[PDB]
Nucleic acid binder design. Sequence first.
DNA 1: ACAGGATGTATATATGTGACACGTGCCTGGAGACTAGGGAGTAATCCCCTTGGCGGTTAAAACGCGGGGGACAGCGCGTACGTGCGTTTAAGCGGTGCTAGAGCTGTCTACGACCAATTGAGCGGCCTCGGCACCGGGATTCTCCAGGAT
DNA 2: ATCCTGGAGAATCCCGGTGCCGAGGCCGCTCAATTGGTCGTAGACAGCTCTAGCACCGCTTAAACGCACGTACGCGCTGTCCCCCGCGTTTTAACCGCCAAGGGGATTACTCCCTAGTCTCCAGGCACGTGTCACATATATACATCCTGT
Lengths: 98, 98, 95, 95, 508, 102, 104, 90, 80
Amino acid sequence: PHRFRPGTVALREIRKYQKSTELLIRKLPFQRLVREIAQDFKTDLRFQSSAVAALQEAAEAYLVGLFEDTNLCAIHAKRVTIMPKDIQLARRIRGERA
Amino acid sequence: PHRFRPGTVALREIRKYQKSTELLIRKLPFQRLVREIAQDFKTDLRFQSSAVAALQEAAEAYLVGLFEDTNLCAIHAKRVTIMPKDIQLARRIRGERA
Amino acid sequence: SKKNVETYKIYIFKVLKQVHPDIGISSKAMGIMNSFINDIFEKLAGESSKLARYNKKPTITSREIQTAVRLVLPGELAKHAVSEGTKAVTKFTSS
Amino acid sequence: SKKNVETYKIYIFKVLKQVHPDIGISSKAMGIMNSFINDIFEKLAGESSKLARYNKKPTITSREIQTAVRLVLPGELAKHAVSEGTKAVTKFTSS
Amino acid sequence: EETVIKLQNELCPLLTGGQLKSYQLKGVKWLISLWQNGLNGILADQMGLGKTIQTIGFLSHLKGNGLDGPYLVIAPLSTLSNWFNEIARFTPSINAIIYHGDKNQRDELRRKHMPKTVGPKFPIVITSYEVAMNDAKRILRHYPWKYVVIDEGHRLKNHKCKLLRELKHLKMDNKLLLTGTPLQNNLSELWSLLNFILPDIFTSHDEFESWFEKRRAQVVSKLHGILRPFILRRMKCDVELSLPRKKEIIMYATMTDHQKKFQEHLVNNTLEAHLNLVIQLRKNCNHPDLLQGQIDGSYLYPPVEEIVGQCGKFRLLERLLVRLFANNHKVLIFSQWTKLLDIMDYYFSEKGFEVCRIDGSVKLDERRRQIKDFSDEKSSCSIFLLSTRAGGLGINLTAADTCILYDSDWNPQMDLQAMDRCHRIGQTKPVHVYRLSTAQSIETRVLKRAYSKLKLEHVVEDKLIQTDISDADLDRLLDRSDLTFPVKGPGWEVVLPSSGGMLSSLNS
Amino acid sequence: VSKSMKAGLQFPVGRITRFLKKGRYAQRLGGGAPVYMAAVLEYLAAEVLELAGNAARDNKKSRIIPRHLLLAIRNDEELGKLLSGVTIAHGGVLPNINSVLL
Amino acid sequence: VSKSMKAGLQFPVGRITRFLKKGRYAQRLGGGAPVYMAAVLEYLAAEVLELAGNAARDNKKSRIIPRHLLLAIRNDEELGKLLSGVTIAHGGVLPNINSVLLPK
Amino acid sequence: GGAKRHRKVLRDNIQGITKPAIRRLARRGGVKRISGLIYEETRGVLKIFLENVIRDAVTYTEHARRKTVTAMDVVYALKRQGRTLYGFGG
Amino acid sequence: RDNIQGITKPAIRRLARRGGVKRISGLIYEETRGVLKIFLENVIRDAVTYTEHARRKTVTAMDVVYALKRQGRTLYGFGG
DNA sequence: ACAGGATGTATATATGTGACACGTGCCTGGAGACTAGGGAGTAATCCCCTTGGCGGTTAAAACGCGGGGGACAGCGCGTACGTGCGTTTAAGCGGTGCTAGAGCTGTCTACGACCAATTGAGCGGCCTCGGCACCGGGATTCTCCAGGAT
DNA sequence: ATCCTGGAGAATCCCGGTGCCGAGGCCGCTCAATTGGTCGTAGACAGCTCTAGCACCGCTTAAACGCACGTACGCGCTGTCCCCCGCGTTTTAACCGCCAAGGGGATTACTCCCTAGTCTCCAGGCACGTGTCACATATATACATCCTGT
Ligand SMILES: Nc1ncnc2c1ncn2[C@@H]1O[C@H](COP(=O)(O)OP(=O)(O)O)[C@@H](O)[C@H]1O
Ligand code: BEF
């Protein structure tokens, strides 16, 4: 059969997800997580669907930026695969303390 | 004679400059540079000595932070010596475009 | 009965038809443009207010708005905006 | 003849002597503390003004200042500041 | 009798192996007349009456004379299997294909059984709601439809529903809305059914609203007369006397002290400290043990003895079960939520009683298999668990002798169609309806709302209810010789099938 | 005649004046401040719309979509610096892959 | 007969009221807003001064210097988060060396 | 007739962000190869960011004496943290 | 002209030592000079705009403080 | 591995000295009291909008397997960085002299808020049709392969 | 060991019909934009000043600069083996469909009590002169730390 190399499929996926410009995270699990985090602060809080959509968009943009910086860190270390130390270094340089 | 290793003298210098807490850049060359950069924008501009001192303090703090992030980048790359690519990566992650 | 929100949709459409007669704009892009314009307006108004409070001046004139534009907008954008604002103020005060 | 600038130097010294009777403060540290207090005051006032303009309320009450404190100050600092402010407001409105 | 037989033969030639009843013959003749005049009608009857038989006779007649056109059957998933079984049994030499399954399966069944053009052996397609809704724009739009039917037309309640749009995208000449309870919750929802069956007769909703104390009687008589030529209706008690009648008993049970302290913890918001509000109080009404278990986080079921003796009307439930086991009669149990069904199934498996459950998670093949083994005589199964949404629509469980509703839906027509699943044609023993409802709770409010909704369907003592039913009262309620016993009793109330409700003021 | 037509600007001068007076950024507002504000806002909107129209014509699309707006903003260095932290909804990122990755 | 004495706060209430009225942050100022502001500012100043005094006493210095202020701010986590972006003149940096850099 | 225990306890809401979702996010970012703990650290960072933004939005809602978190409150909370969202903003 | 070279190699070395850099490369000095020039250009442009707004010919320390605050770096002690 | 010497660093003491803190005149800002009005607190409606679950289905998610490409451990090198010393050059401190420029005070003066009437612009709603989304298919491109030449 | 060229297959791009829903044009109107007058206060401007910024000359000595080195570290190649990736399978959860209930957002009439604005007053706070005690500097001194040979 036809078994592609791990590089060409990754490149095709990168191109497809850079040209798609849609929501990559499922709406229901993200809504569950948002509701859980909100109940962690204060109970009996209702959410607007547009507010949850905006939260999902902002979270996706922030995670995309974090993955940008993590890929930059990994390429700087002469490594194609990203690692938790890359994410930690990106968070430390960006000033986002834990 | 007594010739120390490049590590112990560097450590002593780091400790001394971390405990000194003073101005490391000479005042006259920094003042010349500030006046040149100001004349580059607008001519016939006088400067207050306290303003130049504040500019020098802010520049020293910013350069110390940049060296912090560059050392973090270099240690992440398993290299003791900092390199221009480390400074470029730190500037790119911090969001300070050229 | 209901609040009539004030948006620059008609003016954005007019400017677009002025610069691009054939090209149209959707509703999402119109909302994004309105949000961007409102954010720029709020930022420049806050900067003008800060400038007026720094100089102990209760009034905000074209000078304060020009300074806020030069501070917020970078480089060529600021220069062209200052030129356009000066031309508009001159045409307004002349006629 | 000359402007008398208003600083919290005396009040900072009083608070220091209250918390640390023997420990003193220099002039540079006093100026830094005054600058920090002025910056916090300006930030909280701006946040209260933004909150009042968001809710279309011309008046700023203790609720707006409490919200600005909870927004600016992080975590335990915000909690303790809210507690102290509520205690002070209660003591003021009771007496 | 012989005239009905000969009329059935001369009208429907292919209809063999079964005889239409007098009312079935009148209904199929009414449908033929509606087809002749070209007016689409809403065939309606009680759940016990045979709605599929009259429609299948009408379809066989249409296949007999004239031409044979594409016929579409849109119905719930749990009833299309029974529809195919009845089209194989009551109507030989008539082809019918089930259009349901995966995309590839449905596509291959389509490309194999039915051609692109019309055909003499074109099978009558029987699909589901979701399948037809998804495949209308993709496939169904290409093939015409001379006659379509929609069983359980209460799905067409909302006028803004997506099924209406997907059917409007499709092209069909005639329609046939099949609904056991054509009228539903508030008002004017039937106009959507009227607008779908008759687009020109009822064009807008404001017209039906304008159609709408003496003038109230005048307008209800006017709408009853207007709905007469298009909507036919018959009851189980008036047309036939062969089927024994049903008895509805609301078995009230006092809320236990465990549930009492639960309810006080809810109203003062201290349940979570002990270990919307309407759904929480409802879960407190039926098996709050599972609520506290799921809020605790335990993976194991609580002790079965603790489960039955801790909360709920489970004690009265077990009393009813042992009494019916001594009575040797199959029972049907309907529940609103699947969690209640899971708890009951766990208890029954702990006790060893044979149980079969039919929910949405159960597939079509397993549904048909369970219906078959429950409708069997050798099978010792007596306890059959069902859901009010899936298992309470269109299935014929005649082998059972009584039904018990642990919960009551906000829409009373759903509970009615659920309780009338057992009382069908061929039920030899009298059927009893035991509607469980905890006393002095909000389930009483739900019942009052359901009865206020039943009032408009009909127009087309509290202290004695408070107590708990005793064993002597249980025995007085157990007898079946009355259907072939006061109207009010301690802890139980008898529903009047004609009229009346909990709040007679709103019912009038 | 309206102030917008008097100043030769398409943006509303009276509406911006009312907004600035309601926001109460200052006690008194000069006469040329709303005209200057309208001119600056009109120039910025015209620049952004021109770039978005160019991006849309590049994609053979007649209607401007959020993707075109984001591409036009991120491609230009000036608008990109002005809207660096801005995250446009329903819009992806710039199509770019590092050379080390290829 | 002073508001600061009535509220038991060392910071001036009238000065904060006049500042809020001059800044024109709101058209009308609340009655309890200046007292709340003074209380919050007094608590923040007290916390910062207590941390700086502890840092100075650890260094055997009687008077607080900007170095002690910066040390107390960087050591404290909540004040470090509140005052992350600020730089203190003549304060230096927090003494810390990475373990990889130190020879083991 | 399988033995039953209360079943299918929901996987944690932080686990709702599945591995393919984080993988797609990394592809959009421009990552080719992803390690194992990257998904867990991404879940943690997302949880921290959502905690901050949701705390700010809940404060904004409590200031307005409302029980529903509208989109404007989320937009203001994001603007406080630097990230400005133009689409859903009013 | 050569004022950017006024920031000499020992000064950058002391700054890196205060930062915590153990070994510094030879090419670090030019990059640090460029970064410092960019930062000073931004801050001085903002301060000059602030000064021109007030119709003054002398840059005040308050103007520099405001310019630094606009860029996110607030300086304490020199304000006022 | 341990003894010992050169280097840097921690430590107790004497004597400036310039910055911190305290006493004082006063003045401009803080404080007391009355008033009128507009912002704010509050009861009642309602109807758009949020919550919970069922039915199902289907594309997305998930478990398992083979291998191959990348992360990582180890070694030789030779080149760039660091350390110490003679030297020089520009930073810094002292002292004076000059003047452009920051800041305050008096005097109008042209410019902006307010309010009464109003009448034309934009926001609200129902077509309505054309730009755009999904689809079957032939054509083109990219890539995986085991071969083929040398 | 390359080094070019060969073909089947999965992926991708261009073209044709379509219908459908979101973009675009029209209209009664109503609330905000505009015009005419007034005023008293913010602002533009002429002038005295003094004080702080700019320029220069002389001694100096700490800091900067150039050079010899040798040694520690960045960097290229190699073996691997283990972790990520590509794909058939399945199963399980997203969602779109549907439904009654009801908590909750917004509005309008009202009123009332909290606050803006003004005259008067006097005490807290800031400017200026000043003596001293904490801290900076120099020198001796015991002691911790680093580099090498036995
Ligand atoms: N003429 C008949 N002879 C025997 N049985 C009949 C006849 N008509 C109907 N039935 C029975 O009624 C049932 C089919 O009709 P039914 O399921 O009640 O229609 P629906 O569920 O739509 O109301 C079957 O059980 C069938 O045996
Ligand atoms: F039509 Be169903 F069978 F009731």
